[PDB]
Design an enzyme around this catalytic site. Structure first.
Site, mmCIF file in Angstrom:
data_model
loop_
_atom_site.group_PDB
_atom_site.id
_atom_site.type_symbol
_atom_site.label_atom_id
_atom_site.label_comp_id
_atom_site.label_asym_id
_atom_site.label_seq_id
_atom_site.Cartn_x
_atom_site.Cartn_y
_atom_site.Cartn_z
ATOM 1 N N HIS B 92 -27.320 -1.648 15.238
ATOM 2 C CA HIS B 92 -26.762 -2.591 16.209
ATOM 3 C C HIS B 92 -25.902 -3.657 15.554
ATOM 4 O O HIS B 92 -25.110 -4.313 16.241
ATOM 5 C CB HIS B 92 -27.858 -3.300 17.034
ATOM 6 C CG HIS B 92 -28.711 -2.378 17.838
ATOM 7 N ND1 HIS B 92 -28.191 -1.464 18.736
ATOM 8 C CD2 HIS B 92 -30.061 -2.231 17.886
ATOM 9 C CE1 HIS B 92 -29.183 -0.782 19.285
ATOM 10 N NE2 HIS B 92 -30.329 -1.238 18.796
ATOM 11 N N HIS B 143 -25.948 -12.216 10.889
ATOM 12 C CA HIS B 143 -25.464 -10.834 11.115
ATOM 13 C C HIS B 143 -24.085 -10.932 11.730
ATOM 14 O O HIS B 143 -23.570 -12.016 11.936
ATOM 15 C CB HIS B 143 -26.411 -10.061 12.049
ATOM 16 C CG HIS B 143 -26.532 -10.684 13.412
ATOM 17 N ND1 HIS B 143 -27.558 -11.548 13.755
ATOM 18 C CD2 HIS B 143 -25.717 -10.624 14.487
ATOM 19 C CE1 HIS B 143 -27.371 -11.980 14.994
ATOM 20 N NE2 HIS B 143 -26.262 -11.425 15.464
ATOM 21 N N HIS B 145 -20.536 -9.237 14.143
ATOM 22 C CA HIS B 145 -20.002 -8.496 15.303
ATOM 23 C C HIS B 145 -18.526 -8.346 15.035
ATOM 24 O O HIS B 145 -17.860 -9.284 14.569
ATOM 25 C CB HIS B 145 -20.199 -9.287 16.624
ATOM 26 C CG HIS B 145 -21.635 -9.552 16.947
ATOM 27 N ND1 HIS B 145 -22.447 -8.646 17.589
ATOM 28 C CD2 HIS B 145 -22.422 -10.606 16.630
ATOM 29 C CE1 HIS B 145 -23.676 -9.148 17.688
ATOM 30 N NE2 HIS B 145 -23.679 -10.330 17.112
ATOM 31 N N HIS B 162 -23.084 -14.591 13.044
ATOM 32 C CA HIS B 162 -24.082 -15.352 13.749
ATOM 33 C C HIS B 162 -25.229 -15.675 12.805
ATOM 34 O O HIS B 162 -25.896 -14.770 12.335
ATOM 35 C CB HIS B 162 -24.683 -14.550 14.894
ATOM 36 C CG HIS B 162 -23.777 -14.400 16.082
ATOM 37 N ND1 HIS B 162 -24.007 -13.464 17.078
ATOM 38 C CD2 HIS B 162 -22.640 -15.052 16.420
ATOM 39 C CE1 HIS B 162 -23.048 -13.578 17.992
ATOM 40 N NE2 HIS B 162 -22.215 -14.528 17.620
ATOM 41 N N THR B 240 -27.246 -12.203 22.557
ATOM 42 C CA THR B 240 -26.150 -11.324 23.012
ATOM 43 C C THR B 240 -26.510 -9.837 22.856
ATOM 44 O O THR B 240 -25.639 -8.975 22.907
ATOM 45 C CB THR B 240 -24.807 -11.638 22.297
ATOM 46 O OG1 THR B 240 -24.909 -11.246 20.922
ATOM 47 C CG2 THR B 240 -24.442 -13.132 22.403
ATOM 48 N N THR B 241 -27.798 -9.539 22.655
ATOM 49 C CA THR B 241 -28.307 -8.169 22.657
ATOM 50 C C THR B 241 -29.563 -8.177 23.531
ATOM 51 O O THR B 241 -30.132 -9.248 23.742
ATOM 52 C CB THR B 241 -28.668 -7.648 21.240
ATOM 53 O OG1 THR B 241 -29.601 -8.557 20.614
ATOM 54 C CG2 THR B 241 -27.419 -7.577 20.369
HETATM 55 ZN ZN LIG Z 1 -25.204 -11.833 17.196
#
Ligand SMILES: [Zn+2]
Ligand SMILES: *[C@@H]1O[C@H](CO)[C@@H](O)[C@H](O)[C@H]1NC(C)=O
Ligand SMILES: *[C@@H]1O[C@H](CO)[C@@H](O)[C@H](O)[C@H]1NC(C)=O
Ligand SMILES: *[C@@H]1O[C@H](CO)[C@@H](O)[C@H](O)[C@H]1NC(C)=O
Ligand SMILES: *[C@@H]1O[C@H](CO)[C@@H](O)[C@H](O)[C@H]1NC(C)=O
Ligand SMILES: *[C@H]1O[C@@H](CO)[C@@H](O)[C@H](O)[C@H]1NC(C)=O
Ligand SMILES: [Zn+2]
Lengths: 312, 310
Positions: B92, B143, B145, B162, B240-241
């Site tokens: 992810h 992590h 994106h 993030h 946001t997940t």
């Molecule tokens: Zn994030």
């Protein structure tokens, strides 16, 4: 299960030359056209799109295109009579074409005195007070990319619209056609759909290699899709799809237009990745299952002239 | 036939609750966690990320966060001893974790007088002259994106980082755990690789569900990845997940850092779409550039404020 846009087994597209798609945003574009001519995507040094610099370009502080040397756009509405405007999904973009004599045009400045050594890009090197003439650039089609191919100072836009033009007049080198493209950027907007995009988006085919005639009375307001504040950046570049031919005069409009959340989704689904079940393109059932993209990676300027034009 | 990031048949990831991926950037995130609770991705009205407005936010014309109420970040280098900092591919994102006592922290302003009604997002509504305390926000992981989850005035960035923080102190409500995230944006740059990213990018695993230890001596300069000009936009939002839980205090740094053309490609291939021919029964390789972002969400009347650094 799933298939990249441009590879769907239900595609009715015909391909002259080598297959390609946007899976690596053009990094793997080496191949030949139907005639055996090698693409120049990976070998050219004037490739598009570019990451438009802040420094001496967008900051307003470089040599700007003189008002009198600026490109001028005259686009009336594009109108379907039921068969005279088409929306095409060719497995690489959503593209609008027309089969009536549409009168939209742009005019581009050229040296007043010219011969075989002149090219459509010569305005980039003209001095502000050079004697100038104008050539007519006629649109041949317009089409779309998500996310944007041009970046402005390192930033990406959800959508870019390219209007492709041919010039055949005056310049001796253009007898067989020279090309120029105008790019419009759309920033994401939290409001209602941009109704100017809907005559395209509401009618675009989702199946690869197909087209739809726009219903009689469909109006595409190309002159309104173009920014009213016509600031632009201009440079010499290339087609952003194979064979990536160079020598195109680019205009990138710097004032972005608006696109809604849902419109961005709908466009990306139309260029989306598809899951296909078997039972010959007609022997498959496909559905878009993931949002896609159809853009080329940015290319280095490699010392090319890049100039801002300030409108009025 | 390729596989979306998060669905690769060679994946060693484990999942509690419903499976999900970024195929539709979260539009289809309806589901239940391992305890049978419904995700709130599609139902909440305080969802993240957002398209940060120009009007009365980024224009600096709105109500700004008073200097004294601003979040403050203190990040020293993260340093691996060979097993103490890890880079994880969880199907992810690419995520950095650490198994030693790292001393990086941030502090967040809270009302000086507080009770069980108070929340980590209270600073958003504090008046410039209000009596304030501070709580420590401890990073738990960071992590990435691509493309960016936050947009600034309708513009997308190639990468967002993030840093996730837990607050457990002072606020009664924060037993056990309130959360705050800081997002850093990277604009595309025509120069050389940003060396600050290389300790991560040089070491990120391409196989879903796996991790790799950073080599002894590897340093991640977290405090330099953070912009030195610390302007930020702040609002109350969500994960946001999935499960997209709400109540998080967001900070989005408005001064983007740099990422090279080649680094953006490398990251996107690490979260790439895979072609494959028992997770070990499959051989897979990334064949197309991917993405791992959630679509932007409407503000729905939330308070969004700019903080100008110094
Ligand atoms: Zn994030
Ligand atoms: C529509 O336009 C096309 C191309 O100009 C023309 O051939 C056709 O006869 C037109 N029909 C109508 C309904 O006007
Ligand atoms: C083209 O124009 C240049 C510039 O005036 C001149 O020097 C040259 O002789 C011209 N050549 C041709 C093809 O007439
Ligand atoms: C590395 O750090 C971890 C956690 O602090 C520790 O458990 C381990 O023994 C260390 N290994 C070394 C110094 O080789
Ligand atoms: C603190 O809680 C008390 C009792 O629930 C309540 O009266 C008050 O509104 C709260 N104070 C503030 C300003 O948050
Ligand atoms: C076969 O693929 C699709 C057709 O494009 C779907 O209809 C369907 O979900 C799939 N088979 C199943 C049941 O997973
Ligand atoms: Zn194009």
């Amino acid at each position: 299960c799933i298939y990249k846009f441009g590879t769907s087994p239900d595609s009715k597209a015909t391909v002259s030359g080598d297959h390609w798609d946007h899976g690596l945003n053009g990094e793997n574009w080496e191949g030949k056209d139907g005639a055996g001519n090698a693409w120049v995507c990976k070998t050219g040094r004037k490739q598009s799109p570019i990451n438009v610099p802040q420094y001496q370009v967008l900051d307003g502080k470089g040599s700007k295109i003189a008002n009198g040397l600026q490109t001028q756009w005259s686009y009336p509405d594009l109108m379907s009579n039921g068969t005279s405007v088409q929306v095409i999904n060719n497995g690489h973009t959503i593209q609008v074409q027309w089969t009536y004599n549409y009168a939209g045009h742009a005019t581009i400045a050229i040296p007043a005195m010219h011969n075989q050594t002149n090219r459509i890009v010569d305005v980039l090197e003209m001095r502000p007070n050079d004697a100038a003439d104008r050539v007519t650039a006629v649109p041949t089609q317009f089409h779309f990319h998500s996310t944007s191919e041009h970046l402005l100072a390192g930033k990406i836009y959800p959508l870019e619209l390219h209007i492709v033009h041919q010039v055949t007049e005056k310049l001796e080198a253009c007898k067989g056609g020279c090309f120029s493209v105008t790019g419009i950027l759309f920033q994401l907007d939290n409001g209602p759909d941009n109704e100017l995009l809907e005559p395209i988006f509401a009618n675009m085919p989702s199946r690869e290699g197909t087209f739809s005639n726009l219903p009689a009375g469909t109006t595409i307001k190309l002159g309104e899709l173009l920014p009213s504040d016509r600031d632009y950046v201009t440079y010499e570049g290339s087609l952003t799809t194979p064979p990536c031919s160079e020598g195109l005069l680019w205009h990138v409009m710097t004032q972005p237009q608006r696109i809604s959340f849902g419109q961005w989704n709908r466009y990306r689904l139309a260029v989306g990745l598809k899951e296909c079940n078997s039972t010959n393109p007609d022997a498959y059932t496909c559905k878009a299952v993931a949002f896609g993209q159809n853009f080329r990676n940015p290319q280095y300027a490699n010392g090319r002239t890049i100039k801002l034009a300030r409108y009025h």
